[PDB]
Design a binder for these strands. Sequence first.
RNA 1: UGCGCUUGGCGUUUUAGAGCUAGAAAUAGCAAGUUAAAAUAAGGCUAGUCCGUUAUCAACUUGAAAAAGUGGCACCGAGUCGGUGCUU
Lengths: 115, 1360
Amino acid sequence: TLTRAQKKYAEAMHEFINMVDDFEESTPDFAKEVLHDSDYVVITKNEKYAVALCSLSTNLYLDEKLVDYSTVDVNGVTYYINIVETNDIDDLEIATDEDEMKSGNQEIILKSELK
Amino acid sequence: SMDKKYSIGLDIGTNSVGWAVITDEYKVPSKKFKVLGNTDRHSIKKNLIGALLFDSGETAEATRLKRTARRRYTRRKNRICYLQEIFSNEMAKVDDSFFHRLEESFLVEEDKKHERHPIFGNIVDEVAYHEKYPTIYHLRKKLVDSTDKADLRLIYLALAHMIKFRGHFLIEGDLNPDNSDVDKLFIQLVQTYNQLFEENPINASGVDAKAILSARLSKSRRLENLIAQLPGEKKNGLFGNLIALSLGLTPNFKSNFDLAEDAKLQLSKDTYDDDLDNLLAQIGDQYADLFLAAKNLSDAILLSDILRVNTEITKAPLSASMIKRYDEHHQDLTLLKALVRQQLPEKYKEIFFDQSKNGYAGYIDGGASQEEFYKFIKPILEKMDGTEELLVKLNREDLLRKQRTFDNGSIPHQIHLGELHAILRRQEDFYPFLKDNREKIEKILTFRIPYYVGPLARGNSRFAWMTRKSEETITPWNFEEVVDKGASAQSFIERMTNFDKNLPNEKVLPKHSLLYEYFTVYNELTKVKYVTEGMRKPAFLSGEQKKAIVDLLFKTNRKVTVKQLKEDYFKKIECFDSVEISGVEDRFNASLGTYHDLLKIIKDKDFLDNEENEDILEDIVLTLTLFEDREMIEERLKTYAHLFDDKVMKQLKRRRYTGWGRLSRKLINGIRDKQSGKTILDFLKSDGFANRNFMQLIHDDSLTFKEDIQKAQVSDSLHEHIANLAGSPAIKKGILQTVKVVDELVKVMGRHKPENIVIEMARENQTTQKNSRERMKRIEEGIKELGSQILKEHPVENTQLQNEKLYLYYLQNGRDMYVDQELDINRLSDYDVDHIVPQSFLKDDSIDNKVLTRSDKNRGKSDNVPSEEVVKKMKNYWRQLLNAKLITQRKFDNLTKAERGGLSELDKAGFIKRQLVETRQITKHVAQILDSRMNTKYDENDKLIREVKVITLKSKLVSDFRKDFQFYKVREINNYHHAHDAYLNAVVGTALIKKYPKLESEFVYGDYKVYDVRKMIAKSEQEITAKYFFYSNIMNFFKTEITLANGEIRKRPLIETNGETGEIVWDKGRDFATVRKVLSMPQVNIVKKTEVQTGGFSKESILPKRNSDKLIARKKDWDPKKYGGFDSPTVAYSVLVVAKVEKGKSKKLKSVKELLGITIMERSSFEKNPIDFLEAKGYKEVKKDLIIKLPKYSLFELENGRKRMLASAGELQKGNELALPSKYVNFLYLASHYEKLKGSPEDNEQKQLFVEQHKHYLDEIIEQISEFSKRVILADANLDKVLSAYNKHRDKPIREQAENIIHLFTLTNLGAPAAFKYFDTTIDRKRYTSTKEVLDATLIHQSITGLYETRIDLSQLGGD
RNA sequence: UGCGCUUGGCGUUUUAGAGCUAGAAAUAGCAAGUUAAAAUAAGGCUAGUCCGUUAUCAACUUGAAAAAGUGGCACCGAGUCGGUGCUU
């Protein structure tokens, strides 16, 4: 059949083709375990790695933890299917340059997964 | 006031249930409620309205996959145990501890209780063996071939590696060409293709498929070479994309079937399976046999490419070929390193030494796939000389391959059995115990538990149904003689049959039942219309015509086209010349597949058609659907052996079927109409001039089927009652949560039952442009059917197809719909969109009922459908559009109604039905329960006394009502609207039940007097006496002045009343005020259902070893510092703990008040002995009374009304709701709808003034938010950041400034904080990571409504 | 539209496949890689070739558990619910 998480990603995958480049190399899936554990699927176009944006707890620290990404290629350029794993509270880091990174990244889609 | 009559409103959801209580005057009552607890507050007031929120309810299936996953792994561990047990007695002679070393292979040197080298136990013998047998396959080949006695550990390993990983069981019996060879499975493919396509066969009689496909060339080459033999097949044809799929490529079946959304399918994708089901649904069940003949071919090629041996060199083709692959990998690697040392030596280190990279190091050591890897070295090979060979292997996908890999799904257990069988036959003279267990061992590999038999349980499994024949442990040897195969199967059949939803207790037919197929064709056939010349109006089929057609077209064709029907039958048989056909398009969807399948194999036409053979024939199908199993099928066809040849009989069992229908045989034929004695299927055949359809027959209240269905849904206890209804698991939770709320409310109301309960069910399914492509797709095929040049002349783009005016422009081919006039694409702003059937008659806003004209005046002077003149002028033009599918049939008819005398009483009585009756069957079940629960008393004749009337509304009426009167809704603000919706139903529902009581039968659950609607209707405007209406739209009596289709204005009194009762239903001036008042009330009860988490203990990623002690061991003894483990464990619930603990080197007891997360795994433990558990986790001097269970979403109130919800033991969610004033609400609606208003021009301007004249509400709104965030959200940096950002765009448009003002609400939203942006600018969420404040805060326990609470000040703990 | 039964291939994890030359080391140069074992929710008793992620769950009271109990009303307001005549 199909992983509960997996299914809510496959549809996520449909929506990205929905953006449409008729790209032609067919989209890849990470192992089921990674998907159940990972909380969010984001795709970042224009040849750059996804997300990792900070969250300032009650200064700012990093919030989103990455996993494996695949450089699926549209006719022009690499579109990563970055997978984002939401961060557990105790474990955290403090960002530097990255605040600049979150602002200058354009990402086509972010889809909630576990929920 | 006195009034203890009250009605209840409800808006039932998957994540919410809004509820409201109203009085006869549409007010929401107010009461003080006893506040239990230790605080000083001992009562508060609350308005009787609110909404219960809750996480969705999740399916069992997810758990099921885990269960089988678990079952598979457990029974593999048993296979090996059957091997070792046989081996062990002998092995002990040869090695004392050999098995033991394997047992402990996992463990580190420090924990092993034996020597660290597993097979031989000394480093000399081991290292030797690995240079001699670099893989297991080298060992397997040697054992399969050699004639020498072999060491007994090595014989074991070989055998245990064939048994452990034993390949597939897709193929039954011995391998042979018809089940395994590439050509045969190619033939079956084209055979499957031509069966589908008699009209356009493929002939490949000369074509050598095996060679073409088999040869070592890139998938894409082999695809060209094959289509090269088939003139008249395009490389991306339907047949070409089928081979593409067969080679493992990703073909797009979109073009092949004219799909709106593309259908890229790839056999290696896991999601292929329901990717296929996605395609199948669109193109029907019929093609499944194609894609399965493709799949088997897919196995055939892969298996052909894995075994690359000339047989008879070895009885181990597999192992020998893996060895080849080994050697090939060696050769090619060595050269490669040569070619990189020479040409690109700076990159040598990264490629072969770095496991971070996708290069070879990552491939082996860094978990790179073969796919990732090729794509790494592909550019690098391309840069170099001497790579020519390597690129060929790469682009053939054959470079540096590993032996265990994704392909091996396609390796049949028979092949493994071949090598298994050989090794035994070499050795069984050197080891008599192998001669003596040869058949036992082979059985270990080949025996499989049957599908029907299920878990082999002994009364301790809820799932299992199997029946023992003796009380002894079941082993693959004794199985047939311990398990009662027949009995166990029999209990199989019973459990895996679903019952007819309409008529449970009755099984569902197989989807391929001949009767289900006859039924399905006779249902489609019954709605078909035709015109020959002098045809009167468009005629239906005679029953006798139908019975000849099926006899001639259907029982002569798998599928029948209109062309045959138009030509094969109408001209040929009825001696017609040219017959227009309507009601079907292109071809029939339902055909008698099972009739043709059985005719081929049985070659006895009389037999199929006897119709007393139907029973024999329906049992047959039933077994071929029920069972895959060969043995069982044989047992279950035994009694028709006499009837049939042993040529056919064999061929019978080789036909298999899958799938079940929705319906019971008893449905289709068993039940009869009381008046006519005609079954359902009996009506489908002959119904006369009036030709009814199955959906109609059930709905049609003039017949006995609807009523017996009702009478048949009979079902006791509660959860059983809830369980029974059809619908999603999430909606069963909401139905259950609804009824509890009603119970609490009744209790709240003095235990008085209400007057009425209004139900509606909210829809939250906005999945996506699924429709925006179809819009474009409709236009293209349309614009192509017309041969117009419009799309060329005016460029196509499907996202601006969301402007309805723009959409209708195209659908009408750039012309006026009421005149032979062009429109100007640019000037649409000028034009009016008109509703064909005026709004006054019914509320239809669908594109189906709308048209674009330069001015709505062009329609005619009427209040009817458009004028007889326009109709006669355009009818031709409209006919072309309909034939081209730019307009629907219903739309054509509606325009042309005037021809037919216009809107009749019958028409109007139809709009009324349309508006009232809720079409979804699941709300009716919800109604039944509540009516059943509420109404309990019977009178002195045993008639049920209905004290409460349970009413179901279409969601639309309320949604329309909000839009009509400016009670606008903006979900992004808060959660109140759930509750408001309930209120508004309760209001609209009760009004309606007062003003139109004779219409009760339509919208009240119960059995009532059905009234012909027409009687209600007035013949004229002047007729207005006991006539309910002359204008259909049932919501008219709310409005003061209604506009007609021609600008005229018909007024209505402020104070409507039912004429017959005289009861007063609505004061237009007074009553709306009450509604506006209710909606702007600030105190609404919003309860998040608190929940203990259930499910997995933690994430499922097995991680590599860490010093860190957070990770969780996978076996009790496996320290994750040594063996790795899982990282994050789900918290079941938290638990306030008050105790004293050691604080420093002194070990002195400091008192703490802390919050502890109980993991799902720990729950058992802590819930047996909570103190002991807590004491072992460090706390001492624990106080038992004090400890409090605190699940997810537990509610605390801080100072100043600020509140928090518990997400985990360390984190909170925002607990407050922002009740914004009602005036700003509609402001933010209108503002952000500024362009696509969808309202009449004169008020569509009137509302835009209001926005322009209230842009100072923008600033007032931000200060609403500003004071809110400072008070509760308490995330100052973020509010500073937005406070500047709204300054930065104060001069941007109001439609843009508003639409971003709506995102900003995320900040104030209830629940965990999220990231959000205003325009470009982006705000990072402020997370509430301290749960310290809560400890001294106030808890609040809430009943389901949130009306009864218990308040517990936590700052009174810490003492005695 | 749920709910259920068989069975595979990967994947992940730890160990086993003597790393070598040169050098006090820091380190550099090279060699090698393709396989296997084992675990695949910790585990549980009912010991089955069973079972272990669904439904269900405010608080307080009774029960062994299904389950049963526990919280005036009227008006006038409305920034999350306020006050007041009455009842007791």
